[PDB]
Amino acid sequence: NRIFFILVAAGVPLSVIGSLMHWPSAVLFAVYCVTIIALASYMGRATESLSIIRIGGLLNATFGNAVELIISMFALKEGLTGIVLASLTGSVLGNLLLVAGLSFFVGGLKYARQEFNIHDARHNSGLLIFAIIVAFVIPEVFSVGMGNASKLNLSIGISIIMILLYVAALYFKEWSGKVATIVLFAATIVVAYISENLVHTFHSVAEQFGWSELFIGVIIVAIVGNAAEHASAIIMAFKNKMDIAVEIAVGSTLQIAMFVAPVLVICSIFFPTSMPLVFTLPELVAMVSAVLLMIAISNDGDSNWFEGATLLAAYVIMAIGFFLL
Amino acid sequence: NRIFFILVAAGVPLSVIGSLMHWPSAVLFAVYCVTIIALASYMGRATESLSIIRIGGLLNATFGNAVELIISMFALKEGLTGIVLASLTGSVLGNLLLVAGLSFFVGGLKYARQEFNIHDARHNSGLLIFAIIVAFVIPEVFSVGMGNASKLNLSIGISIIMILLYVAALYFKEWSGKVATIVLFAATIVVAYISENLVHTFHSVAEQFGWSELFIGVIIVAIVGNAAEHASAIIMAFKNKMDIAVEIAVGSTLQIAMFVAPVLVICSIFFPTSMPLVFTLPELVAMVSAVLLMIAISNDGDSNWFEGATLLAAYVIMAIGFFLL
Amino acid sequence: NRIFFILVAAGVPLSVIGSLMHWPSAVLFAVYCVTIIALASYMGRATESLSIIRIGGLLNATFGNAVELIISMFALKEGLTGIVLASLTGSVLGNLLLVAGLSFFVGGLKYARQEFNIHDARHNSGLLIFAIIVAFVIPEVFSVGMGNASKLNLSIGISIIMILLYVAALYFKEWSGKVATIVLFAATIVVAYISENLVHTFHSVAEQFGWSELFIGVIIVAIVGNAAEHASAIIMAFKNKMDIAVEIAVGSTLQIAMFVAPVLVICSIFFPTSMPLVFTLPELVAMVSAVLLMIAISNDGDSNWFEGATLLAAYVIMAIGFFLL
């Protein structure tokens, strides 16, 4: 809490006056981003409260990734569709191993029996294998030479069935109230206003300090949007059952996969530019690996001191690879 | 039963006179195919009875996919080796998720505890991972630039060890009798005679209504040959233990993988044209995904109302992708 | 024991005088290699004794693959970096399925309940998925067009974190003594002296009897270095719990993945030539398959008469594919 208050209150004016100064561009992005972490850290706490207060699963789904959903909206109008696609990548990579890895590792003070074996396999994996592997992989391979008109039609079908299933499944499946109200202005508008700045910022930082443009989306942009907002997980270690921690990471990721991207892909239509679900091989091999890692660890659990270390390593390895490109 | 009687009795004369009329080609294929569904629906019931009556596992293996084995024989003489390879693809895709997906979904009236956990993992997965991943994937990657003479030699080795293992493993591992007799004439000859028509038909439908040639093999042709014959599975929901239903789908698929294709690959030798086990990337990524899906779901079970919905979605997604190519 | 004594005592003088004769080259490699099998069979027994006598896990890690580590050192100075990379491949392929496959199959006299279910999943798979899939796959995809300077930097990072984790994890995690002493001279010097011969030998056998150069590394070279040394596993069937047998195969392989290669990659720096972790697609698809196979079988166990047969088949299939290239 303490640190986060400082960053919201210091970040917004600096970001505002920074937008008024207009230069230098490189330092301000740096400032722009920093605020949003904290802004998403609140965004996350505000949703968690509302979800605790059936259909609140929509709020957890939409507004729980609203900073992901939002930074990617205006990147879509000014799209820059590439950044959108790189950022969706980063969302899955971010929860795994990063949020999950940080959770497992930090709360590796003392090992906690063996849980939750009967739950995870049945629900988490299937869609997770199903969602990612179907959703993203199929588009990539099939779209090689189709070409364009076919690409988006496939995406539309996939996207539409993903939501139509997600809604079909979901719908059939501390200190609250004040936070549920204050979120929108403190975040959803400030985040949306700082957003407008971010895209214009990127080309310039990409030309001045590279590389690369894709890296920005994949590591930095995701760190801010998804990780920070979902960082709730790490905190709930030992003090409460890490049951919820794996739920938060994978449930959120599933939602990215089955909801964020598909809706966002839909959105791409109403503006002239169109994003089909096309990923780079380095992006896709990275995603399926994380499913495999998650799956490997998820078998018995509950967690180990280096259950997280293994994960964090894998993620930081992928980050440095993504930077080198 | 009721519907199937209508389609056999109406389909065969139409198909015969259609073969006599010789035109238009497009409509008749359409008619040709329709009959065979029903013809394979009987083909399947006739084998199931015989299997119920040790070595009856050969009958279940051979004649249980005889319509797959058969439509692909004359496509091999007139091969058109491509269609053969696309159809083998469709067989695995068809059982998964389609037959398995339809079974799981339809019998999702009320959930049935958690089964069969100790059986499935040990037997179904290993060969399934082993069979598909080894059988098909290895050929594809290794065959990139070998070239030709090497391709088939690898296939021969793989094919031969697959049978030699399958026979080695298998051999060491209602209303009957009348159906066991009537099958051959009612089906194996009629199916074989309608077959002769099918191949000649495809180029024309492929040139008039496309696309594509591969699609025909992958979705339509498989629907008819394998799915229909194996559709037994869907029916046995709730009324009987779905134990057999997962057995039918995966056992059949394993047999395709370890038997149908390998024998069929062997056959390719005695005619001049030769098919090595070469698949397109879109075909192969689709197959391994289905193993992964099957594996994901297979962990605990027993099944969910949307255990099937997830599957059916994935399959229909792959079908529309395969059509777009 | 009996056979191995004959091969050490006959192999070394022949190899020495062979090195003095200098011709013909093809037959001597053949002789060179044969000795080393036996030399590594001792190398293995000498380490197993020392390990039985905390930090002895380093000896098991280093000297347990010292013939792999060593044949690849001088191939690195004279590198020929390709052979190094093909040989690391062969190490994982060798343990799986070959050592593991031979163990499972040979001790398939009578099936031994269902073990060891709770152990294997938690530890063996995660790193195994993590180690191989991260370690090797990531480098391959990401390194496509980086190019060179980036390649090795990624490798360095990966390599360094792999050891830094492996040491971090490991360190936190019959007839002895005389063998622990005699090993070095009988093997580590003789093996090192026969090594000097091996590399110079390969081009010539590769030009006279091909193919291919990669094959040499992938099948032959690995058979000798890793399999022979680790062949301890096969022997401990029934007489003792096959607990250790799966431990030997996978623990060794994990060590290859997390230690052998990374250290060896490091070594590549001090000489002018540099090996980044770059694999061919046929090499990599082969490795991940073996993880998948291992994983598939590892689910319940304990083993079946043809649990090994399935494996041995897959391996021999990969060997013939690797030869055809």
From Swiss-Prot, chains A, B, C:
Ranges annotated as spanning the membrane: 3-23, 24-44, 55-75, 82-102, 126-146, 152-172, 179-199, 215-235, 256-276, 277-297, 305-325
Result for mutant: residue 68 to A: Lack of activity
Membrane topology: Multi-pass membrane protein
Effect of residue 255 to A: Almost loss of activity
Any single biological process term in GO: calcium ion transmembrane transport
Keyword Cell membrane found: yes
Activity regulation comment: Calcium efflux is tightly regulated by intracellular pH.
Domain of life: Bacteria
GO CC term, one of those recorded: plasma membrane
Keyword Cytoplasm assigned: no
Xref: NCBIfam families: caca2, cax
Subunit-level organization: Homotrimer.
Family: Belongs to the Ca(2+):cation antiporter (CaCA) (TC 2.A.19) family. Cation/proton exchanger (CAX) subfamily.
Protein name: Ca(2+)/H(+) antiporter ChaA
Biological source species: Bacillus subtilis (strain 168)
